[PDB]
Amino acid sequence: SRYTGPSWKVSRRLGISLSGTGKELARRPYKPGQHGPNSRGKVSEYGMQLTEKQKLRHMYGMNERQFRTLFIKASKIKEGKHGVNFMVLLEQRLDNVVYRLGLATTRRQARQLVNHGHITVDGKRVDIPSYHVEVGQVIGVREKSQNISTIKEAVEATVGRPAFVSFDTEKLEGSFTRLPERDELYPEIDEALVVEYYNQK
Amino acid sequence: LSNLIEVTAYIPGIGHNLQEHSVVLLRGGRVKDLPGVRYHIVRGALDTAGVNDRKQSRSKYGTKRPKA
Amino acid sequence: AVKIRLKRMGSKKSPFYRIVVADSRSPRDGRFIETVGTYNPLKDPAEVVLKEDLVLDWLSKGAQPSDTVRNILSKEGVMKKHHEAKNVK
Amino acid sequence: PNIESAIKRVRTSANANAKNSSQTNAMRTAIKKFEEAVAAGADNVDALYNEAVKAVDMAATKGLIHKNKANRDKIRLSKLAK
RNA sequence: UGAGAGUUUGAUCCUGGCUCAGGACGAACGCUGGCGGCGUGCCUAAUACAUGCAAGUCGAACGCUUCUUGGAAAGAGGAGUGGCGGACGGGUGAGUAACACGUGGGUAACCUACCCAUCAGAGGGGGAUAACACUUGGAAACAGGUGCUAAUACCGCAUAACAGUUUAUGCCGCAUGGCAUAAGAGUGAAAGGCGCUUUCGGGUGUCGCUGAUGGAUGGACCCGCGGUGCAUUAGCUAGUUGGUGAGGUAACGGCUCACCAAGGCCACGAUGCAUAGCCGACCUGAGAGGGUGAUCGGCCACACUGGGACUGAGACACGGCCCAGACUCCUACGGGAGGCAGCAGUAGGGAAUCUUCGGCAAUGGACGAAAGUCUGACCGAGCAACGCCGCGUGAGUGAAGAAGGUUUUCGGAUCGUAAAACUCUGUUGUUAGAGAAGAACAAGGACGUUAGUAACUGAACGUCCCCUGACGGUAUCUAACCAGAAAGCCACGGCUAACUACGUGCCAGCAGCCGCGGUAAUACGUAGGUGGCAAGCGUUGUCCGGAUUUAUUGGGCGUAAAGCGAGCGCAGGCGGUUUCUUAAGUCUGAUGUGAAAGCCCCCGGCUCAACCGGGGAGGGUCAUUGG
């Protein structure tokens, strides 16, 4: 499964945008349902760690088993911290590479582009979105049929291109220069609440 | 029971169809109503039948999904 | 009846083989004496690795190859060396 | 029996048993015939010692006693007469 | 790499139990389900078993017989004598508390078919028998009698002692003794087949045959140490413990005998009773630990229940023999036949566990000189969300919030950018084209080299032609078409994330622990909404954690549970100061070993991942030798 629901209730429940600052929390910044505008008392310190974890899980649209295995894998580095290495491994998945490069507006669109077989790493096609893109691998746009309507238009309007992403808008090749850093990556949510959430799992 | 030791067992839900000499299935679970009862029968698993109003936790009580 | 034979180590339809010296009564994947090289039927020019200093020692003690082991031991030039050590002295 | 080859082994081994027992009894009586004449103190005492030795030796080439049993036997008899 | 919470009271602190929040599984069952990849699937009655298959092969060891092409040579069948195989491979865990297993050693007490090497032989004779032909008794299974015949079948005679044993010599070892050399005494084997040269040539290639010695491989025996409950189980032994001799075995030995003696084992747990195959490993834990021994590998034990031997290099024998017993079956009543804990399958037991499938193409195994024949091992296919992993059931833009549902103080709020509408996409689906790797070979032809030869045939490997796929038209790749076929289960009073209506009225019902329900129930039952997970989601059972709640790590005994009513003392546990010595504990170095697969570290291949491969570390309370 992935998810198909209204995708905007989700942001109103975390209190974070999740869609490139394009405002879902413009009107009614409160939660969904009857008891939306009428908030109530405090939230535990279990609700806080759960809310941080859900923020990160819904950012990149993955499921709970895969999230937890990625977290367990990031723990075997021991070079740096354990939340930084996590949120950095999270960025190296082929879906974020298409999002950051700029071939798609959303992450759902980028996911459908990499699922339906329209992109290639090093020339060879790769079809599965949880792929692990390493540093220095020019991912391309299937030079067979790169004349599609939405890819073309979403290359023009560059809302955000980062300081670790390289790209050329003629051959349509991009790559990571090097690994990013927390200052360059959502210094807003957390990586410590999420680490504590998995201590008693 | 098949091993020939005797026990009493609670039958849950609203309304059943159990009569003398009908064959049933037991699971663990102790009721806190009176002594001497330590088991539950499971609804909709043999001669016993699922309850016929439920709409909310039909996986217990053994109710099938209704088109309503 | 010591032998030099192949031993299957793939998954289901991607086989791999270890070259092994075993007593002939043993099961194909059961007990053996020691391992002597490797062999890969895929990988279009098939891959052989082997020590070839234990093959020449077992051969001179009466071990005997199977039919495929003899083919891949002559493609490596091990049977010629046995020839030049035994019937030459 | 069920298998065809198991039916042949039955008669083959029956025949082997027959002749094996015949020849073992031959050897045993040769030895005993020497012993009963060394226990009497009789003339013609080295010839039947020779014959008993030969009997044991021939039984060992017919696959009836192992080979160490034959060494043991010849030793025992040697210590009795010669 | 060591997280806690609720619950004794009118309120408190301490003690204390009970319960919950994490994992995992050969799982079962309730509701519900789209696919691929890799794995897994009688835990119960070691219950009883219809039907098919699971072990044969050799005509280049030997005589016969039937055909297809009266004397003809080949091809294809049939039984028989003889060799080798049937002790492997495959199944199960009933017995077993012991050298059964693990780890470390010993055998100067040992055996070993096929395979590799070395030395020496391979001479000359004899008497039979199955088959076949005729014949008797048989319900049958099957038994007898007469006559002829072959061999690599069988038996004696020769020749061989390098084997064993005894004597002298030399060297040596941990008692018994070991090695090498010399003699002396009695003794023991053997078989041919197919080719080449064939002047009688009498020579020779190859595969077999006999004796002796090594290697390899497989087995046998003995020893140190280690892993379970009960003392509401303290005595156990009479071939028992030792000696002398005799027999016996591959082999040492009370292994078994006759005699002689009175010994052996036990509080450091003998004996008995109950339970159990053992290990690599697997789950959990911060660790020390605790709980399991299913898939895969190693060792053991058993084969309808209980005794025995025979053949053989090897069995006291898994689809062998003989006897007894229970059970089942056929019979002319005199008698006969059988053993799924091999693969499928059936009835029964159970909460519960699969097809009476294809093929020897690949790897291994038996026989054969080889083509080959056999192989339910094995390689593939079928069934099942049983598990792990991967990808879907669309994507983008879209408002004053369309209709409807729920609520409302009747203004509105929420389901909700969610639908609509516009533009896109084709992983999947469908239809149509193309389309694999897994295969290396044996055999058969030509050609070369080396060691043997009088010489050639052949031997042993090199180079080249030629020859084979069950899965299967499978994976995969290309073209067109369509958002169309593909979301459910649990919870929402506190623990613990997520609230309002209506119905009912200590009823109907709910609960893991606190506890809810008697007119305005966020705790029962529905609806709207919300939370957690998702092709799954909950429930019951079992184990480790939380539990310092058996505390070595790591607790206590004035009043909470807990100092024997007091002394005297055998065994045990622990002991003042100091000089020299020893090296049992302790510390340390080097060498051997602790299989493979697993966990872990680095690297690499399947579009990724599960999964697969290569190189390492780790794991001993271990042994030997030096400080």
mmCIF file of C-alpha atoms in Angstrom, chain D:
data_model
loop_
_atom_site.group_PDB
_atom_site.id
_atom_site.type_symbol
_atom_site.label_atom_id
_atom_site.label_comp_id
_atom_site.label_asym_id
_atom_site.label_seq_id
_atom_site.Cartn_x
_atom_site.Cartn_y
_atom_site.Cartn_z
ATOM 1 C CA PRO D 1 11.246 -61.969 -0.670
ATOM 2 C CA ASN D 2 10.131 -59.226 -3.073
ATOM 3 C CA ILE D 3 13.121 -58.135 -5.141
ATOM 4 C CA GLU D 4 14.382 -60.597 -7.739
ATOM 5 C CA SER D 5 17.999 -60.199 -6.651
ATOM 6 C CA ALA D 6 17.132 -61.009 -3.043
ATOM 7 C CA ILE D 7 15.821 -64.416 -4.137
ATOM 8 C CA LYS D 8 19.148 -65.433 -5.703
ATOM 9 C CA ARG D 9 21.202 -64.435 -2.650
ATOM 10 C CA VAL D 10 19.175 -66.941 -0.596
ATOM 11 C CA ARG D 11 20.290 -70.034 -2.519
ATOM 12 C CA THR D 12 23.786 -68.686 -3.155
ATOM 13 C CA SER D 13 24.414 -68.164 0.550
ATOM 14 C CA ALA D 14 22.796 -71.485 1.446
ATOM 15 C CA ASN D 15 25.311 -73.262 -0.805
ATOM 16 C CA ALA D 16 28.233 -71.259 0.557
ATOM 17 C CA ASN D 17 27.166 -72.217 4.083
ATOM 18 C CA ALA D 18 27.095 -75.905 3.167
ATOM 19 C CA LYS D 19 30.637 -76.096 1.848
ATOM 20 C CA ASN D 20 32.056 -73.700 4.463
ATOM 21 C CA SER D 21 30.835 -75.891 7.305
ATOM 22 C CA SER D 22 32.133 -79.052 5.630
ATOM 23 C CA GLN D 23 35.654 -77.678 5.370
ATOM 24 C CA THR D 24 35.709 -76.199 8.883
ATOM 25 C CA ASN D 25 34.788 -79.592 10.316
ATOM 26 C CA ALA D 26 37.603 -81.130 8.283
ATOM 27 C CA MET D 27 40.103 -78.783 9.939
ATOM 28 C CA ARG D 28 38.718 -79.295 13.445
ATOM 29 C CA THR D 29 38.959 -83.080 13.216
ATOM 30 C CA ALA D 30 42.520 -82.941 11.886
ATOM 31 C CA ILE D 31 43.580 -80.874 14.903
ATOM 32 C CA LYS D 32 41.720 -83.079 17.373
ATOM 33 C CA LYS D 33 43.217 -86.192 15.764
ATOM 34 C CA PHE D 34 46.657 -84.822 16.509
ATOM 35 C CA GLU D 35 45.737 -83.931 20.092
ATOM 36 C CA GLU D 36 44.385 -87.387 20.934
ATOM 37 C CA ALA D 37 47.667 -88.946 19.743
ATOM 38 C CA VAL D 38 49.954 -86.579 21.616
ATOM 39 C CA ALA D 39 47.911 -87.285 24.745
ATOM 40 C CA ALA D 40 48.578 -91.023 24.271
ATOM 41 C CA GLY D 41 52.317 -90.876 23.632
ATOM 42 C CA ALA D 42 52.096 -92.766 20.346
ATOM 43 C CA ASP D 43 54.462 -93.512 17.513
ATOM 44 C CA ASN D 44 53.530 -91.603 14.339
ATOM 45 C CA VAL D 45 53.424 -88.305 16.214
ATOM 46 C CA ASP D 46 55.280 -85.853 13.973
ATOM 47 C CA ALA D 47 53.442 -86.788 10.768
ATOM 48 C CA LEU D 48 50.033 -85.859 12.151
ATOM 49 C CA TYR D 49 51.508 -82.685 13.638
ATOM 50 C CA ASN D 50 52.548 -81.809 10.087
ATOM 51 C CA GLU D 51 49.099 -82.712 8.794
ATOM 52 C CA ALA D 52 47.314 -80.513 11.337
ATOM 53 C CA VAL D 53 49.549 -77.564 10.491
ATOM 54 C CA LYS D 54 48.789 -78.037 6.796
ATOM 55 C CA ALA D 55 45.070 -78.277 7.559
ATOM 56 C CA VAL D 56 45.017 -74.916 9.330
ATOM 57 C CA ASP D 57 47.083 -73.257 6.595
ATOM 58 C CA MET D 58 44.710 -74.480 3.880
ATOM 59 C CA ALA D 59 41.675 -73.284 5.826
ATOM 60 C CA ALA D 60 43.173 -69.796 5.920
ATOM 61 C CA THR D 61 43.434 -69.608 2.121
ATOM 62 C CA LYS D 62 39.792 -70.685 1.746
ATOM 63 C CA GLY D 63 38.524 -67.648 3.649
ATOM 64 C CA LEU D 64 37.339 -69.590 6.694
ATOM 65 C CA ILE D 65 39.530 -68.293 9.550
ATOM 66 C CA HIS D 66 40.955 -64.804 9.374
ATOM 67 C CA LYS D 67 44.772 -64.859 9.366
ATOM 68 C CA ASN D 68 45.632 -64.035 12.952
ATOM 69 C CA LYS D 69 43.599 -67.006 14.133
ATOM 70 C CA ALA D 70 45.864 -69.160 11.988
ATOM 71 C CA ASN D 71 49.050 -67.699 13.476
ATOM 72 C CA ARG D 72 47.589 -68.320 16.944
ATOM 73 C CA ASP D 73 46.689 -71.913 16.055
ATOM 74 C CA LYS D 74 50.068 -72.802 14.595
ATOM 75 C CA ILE D 75 51.735 -71.253 17.658
ATOM 76 C CA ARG D 76 49.638 -73.285 20.088
ATOM 77 C CA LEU D 77 50.270 -76.551 18.257
ATOM 78 C CA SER D 78 53.983 -75.818 17.931
ATOM 79 C CA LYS D 79 54.300 -75.407 21.679
ATOM 80 C CA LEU D 80 52.727 -78.854 22.212
ATOM 81 C CA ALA D 81 54.848 -81.122 19.994
ATOM 82 C CA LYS D 82 57.761 -79.319 18.301
#
